[PDB]
Amino acid sequence: KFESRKIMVPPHRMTPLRNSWTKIYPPLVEHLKLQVRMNLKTKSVELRTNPKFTTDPGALQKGADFIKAFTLGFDLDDSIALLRLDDLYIETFEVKDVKTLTGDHLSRAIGRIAGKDGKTKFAIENATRTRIVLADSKIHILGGFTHIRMARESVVSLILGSPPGKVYGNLRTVASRLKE
């Protein structure tokens, strides 16, 4: 008769949400027939289901996942894929899980992922059909299950220290195998 999920927005994401608020609720209320409100008392959004006009149990999860992706920092038009498609997932980890490194070693490592003008990150998102965000030490990868793994195993080798040139060559191999 009633079920709901409450989810919280961290402060640096708060302003982007306000600026986009009029864009995100029409897709939820129309296409999913959920009901929603922004509860500024506790810097959270709440999604609520009415049993009288809703289609199937999957609606409520899709809505939460869509909002959840936004607070991680994905673009709005990247998050919206979670309403449309059905098999997308998010993976996340932090560089201290791979290798313990601390000072300027830490800063250089994430610089090595982005590359100059972001061109190295952009490359990885093309050879594997996925989206990537770097939020200081934490990495989040959004995509299909097998594509995620292909992305992970190459971002890992950068933080282990391999030169960028060697990694571009590997991306060429993976891309041709997808063609087969």
Add this chain to the structure above:
RNA sequence: UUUGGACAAACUUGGUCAUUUAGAGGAACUAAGGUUUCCGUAGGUGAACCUGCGGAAGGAUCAUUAAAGA
């Protein structure tokens, strides 16, 4: 010819160090693939190529974050 004294060349027998030369006898002895890059320390492999602990860059930063009239 001879007593004692100071000066004092030099001789003999051992020890030790250095050198010349004959000269064995021997060892001789020589000739005719990696792929982040490094430092100190300890261990491993016929062999660069390996492994443990601590350190350096002399190595390529995309995106996002606060806004004011009782």
